């Protein structure tokens, strides 16, 4: 039953450091077992290092060589990616990845496998901010055709992410939550609607959970007619 | 040479066969073992061949993976327009210091789809915003296909350009897309005007939706 699960998404000032968990479950870490590989926003794949066939140590690409540190703690089943002199263009997504059981042993190769969900790092000088939660109610401007449709405004945070849930999963079905706009101020804001059926809104309870983990903010907004 | 290239964009309709190259060199894709993985949007790759041909479990037999000299092709057959994601090649190059490559990835679109014209909905300032000595007009554009809109806003008839954001289209779950669009305006412009409308440009032909404090 193969996961892994990777620390939440930070921000750090030029210049700082980050240092990025990733906690792996169903499958033995073996001190070698860990590669990282990263993702700027819209670019490809970039992998940072790990455990190659030839060399019987870690290894780190040519671009990371000065300033990454990548260590594996056998007791704790815990990887951990260290990366310092942080500049603009380390903005990423940082992923670990394993080869866990698929190692071959007729030639040593193993793919990566198992990837955890990746966390988003963002290097920057602004502040963390929580966001505002605001309803979008549904209306007739909204309703047509037997359904209706009803949102929640994710507005003014730092930095990115956010997640929105609604009915704390129970609702699904109709949901769309839009890619973040980076307004002119420096703080991100963003939307999640969805269509229901507009004979539920006398009766059914509609609530957005909205969670941004970086500034531990936390709000679930029942939105009303 | 210690380079995977891949072309940056492929496309083909539902049902159909198409393929993904991935180039190298001799010490990379000449000496050592593929591997293909899938990216959806938000989500982290996930592995979809391994050793040049063998599919982990739970892979379609609809992907397939293959190598010959320098290069490697991943084919999917039977497209559907839940394959729409990015693509990598992926290996270990055997030479200088270095170790695992990725190519640049390749954008694969599923082109299904008929022209669909975008839905407007408005949404006023909430109540709580306003108490908030705030104000935000929302824009959601949804069900157009293709995914290229322009969007502007007026107020009583006279463009407003100051305070708009917008969203780059993404696709819905039903596969059109959809974008938003928000003005930020103070309560007493809000509850000044007559009316503010978003106007949505689509394939040369424009709608608009209108609003006004009053309503």
């Known amino acids: 039953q193969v996961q892994v699960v990777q620390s939440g998404a930070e921000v750090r000032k030029p210049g700082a450091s980050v240092k990025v968990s990733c906690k792996v479950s169903?499958?033995?870490?073996?001190?070698?077992?860990i590669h990282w590989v990263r993702q700027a926003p819209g670019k490809g794949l970039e992998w940072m290092g790990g455990?190659?066939?030839?060399?019987?140590?870690?290894i780190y690409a040519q671009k990371f060589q000065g300033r990454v540190s990548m260590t594996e703690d056998t007791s704790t089943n815990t990887a951990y990616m260290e990366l310092s002199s942080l500049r603009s263009e380390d903005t990423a997504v940082y992923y670990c990845?394993?080869?866990?059981?698929?190692?071959?042993?007729?030639?040593?190769?193993?793919?990566?496998?198992?990837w955890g969900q990746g966390t988003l790092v963002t290097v920057s000088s602004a502040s963390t901010k929580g966001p505002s939660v605001f309803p979008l109610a549904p209306s007739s401007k909204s309703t047509s055709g037997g359904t209706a449709a009803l949102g929640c405004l994710v507005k003014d945070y730092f930095p990115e992410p956010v997640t929105v849930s609604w009915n704390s999963g129970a609702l699904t079905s109709g949901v769309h939550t839009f890619p973040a706009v980076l307004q002119s101020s420096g703080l991100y804001s963003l939307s999640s609607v969805v269509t229901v059926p507009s004979s539920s809104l006398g009766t059914q309870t509609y609530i957005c959970n909205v969670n941004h983990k970086p500034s531990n903010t936390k709000v679930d907004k029942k939105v009303e007619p | 040479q210690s380079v995977l290239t891949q072309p940056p964009s492929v496309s083909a309709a539902p049902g159909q066969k198409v393929t993904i190259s991935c180039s190298g060199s001799?010490?990379?894709?000449?000496?050592?073992?593929v591997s293909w993985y899938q990216q959806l949007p938000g989500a982290a790759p996930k592995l979809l061949i391994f050793?040049?041909?063998q599919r982990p479990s739970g892979i379609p037999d609809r992907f397939s993976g293959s190598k010959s000299g320098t290069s490697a092709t991943l084919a999917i057959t039977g497209l559907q327009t839940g394959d729409e994601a990015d693509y990598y090649c992926?290996?270990?190059?055997?030479?200088?210091?270095?170790?695992?490559?990725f190519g640049g990835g390749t954008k694969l679109t599923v082109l299904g789809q008929p022209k669909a014209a975008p839905s407007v909905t408005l949404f006023p300032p909430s109540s709580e915003e306003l108490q908030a000595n705030k104000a935000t007009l929302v824009c959601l554009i949804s069900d157009f296909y293709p995914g290229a809109v322009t969007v502007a806003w007026k107020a009583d008839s006279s463009p407003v350009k100051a305070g708009v954001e917008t969203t780059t289209p993404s696709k819905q779950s039903n596969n059109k897309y959809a974008a938003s669009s928000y003005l930020s305006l103070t309560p007493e412009q809000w509850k000044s005007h007559r009316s503010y409308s978003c106007q949505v440009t689509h394939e040369g032909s424009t709608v608009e939706k209108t609003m006004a404090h009053a309503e």
């Open positions: 990845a394993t080869g866990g059981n698929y190692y071959n042993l007729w030639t040593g190769y193993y793919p990566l496998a198992y």
């Open positions: 169903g499958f033995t870490l073996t001190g070698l077992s």
């Open positions: 455990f190659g066939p030839e060399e019987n140590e870690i």
């Open positions: 001799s010490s990379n894709i000449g000496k050592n073992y």
């Open positions: 050793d040049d041909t």
């Open positions: 992926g290996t270990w190059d055997s030479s200088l210091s270095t170790g695992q490559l």
